[PDB]
Symmetry: C3
Subunit: 103 residues, 3 copies
């Protein structure tokens, strides 16, 4: 399992949600954040961004990453980043069932 | 070490904090988030919206490898209702844990 | 790569921001959070009575860097965020397997793994 962490422009949230839902990735956690890098800033200098976290099976990562890149990109500085983090266990609170990679 | 990341119903925060404190797990970082999944969206269509991302609470607790199963069980027991939308717990590896005030760094090796 | 996750006092954000950009670490993601641990506070309030609170306001700073830059990033945050008092915060170092730049579609992975 992996956690796909995307930091995007806030106006791209609807595009990203749609692109993920279409491919069967309905579950996601969204956080309002701020950030900086190569951009700025007409500065402040921390601009509003949106963090989208999706925990998926190892084999779905490339599909999820590609779905987010395609829906969040503009080609301009400030599009954001996607960080892939290992997840050792994913537990569904209501059932107690836990998802692990067979290994 | 591991970071136990729980995404729960906001009204369960007090229950989760209590269940963790009683087992000796006092340290935690809490974030207000939104989410979607299996759970049905809120509507709310007032005349004269929508709201598909529901309010949730993220609880992050960094613990030793051997305490994970106890922390996970404490959160499942205190955050569950049995209804769609209870949330998830994700266990992420933590390689180093630094206490800013002392500069002391915890590292694991097995 | 690694994600350096620092949970600091909110008033230290500007110091941390400055100490990181000084060393060439311009990219960062900042989140407003709450927390608790060793530090206790307020426990002191105005109204004639009222003496509560639980989770104190904190700031999370996340910076994704190459493996060899971690110790420098950690030291820069420790130096700029410390007061010496309880509640200064923590730094957690988490592994990052892939780092994608959305605008170009270019993905950074660690060389030593297939594929
Ligand atoms: N090394 C990094 N660590 C953490 N977050 C980062 C990092 N670099 C960029 N970000 C995040 O991604 C957002 C966009 O980054 P930026 O460098 O300005 O975009 P881009 O590389 O597409 O031009 C930032 O506002 C910040 O939230
Ligand atoms: N794959 C996922 N990645 C990230 N967050 C998720 C994921 N699936 C669910 N969530 C989070 O858990 C919350 C509850 O998920 P939901 O599917 O509605 O119910 P349940 O936990 O009972 O399956 C969501 O609102 C979201 O915050
Ligand atoms: N085990 C932990 N897991 C997650 N967050 C923690 C943990 N311990 C501390 N924190 C975070 O760091 C902040 C400060 O921690 P605290 O123990 O009160 O003081 P100090 O960090 O100086 O030891 C907390 O308010 C919380 O946001």
């Amino acid at each position: 399992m992996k956690m796909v962490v995307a930091v995007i422009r806030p106006e791209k949230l609807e595009c990203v949600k749609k692109a993920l839902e279409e491919r069967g990735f309905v579950g996601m956690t969204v956080t309002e954040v701020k950030g900086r890098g190569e951009q700025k800033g007409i500065e402040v200098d921390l601009l509003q961004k949106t963090k989208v976290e999706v925990v998926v099976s190892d084999d779905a990562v490339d599909e999820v990453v590609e779905a987010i890149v395609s829906s969040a990109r503009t080609g301009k500085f400030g599009d954001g980043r996607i960080f892939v983090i290992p997840v050792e266990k994913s537990v569904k609170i209501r059932t107690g069932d836990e998802e692990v990679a067979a290994a």
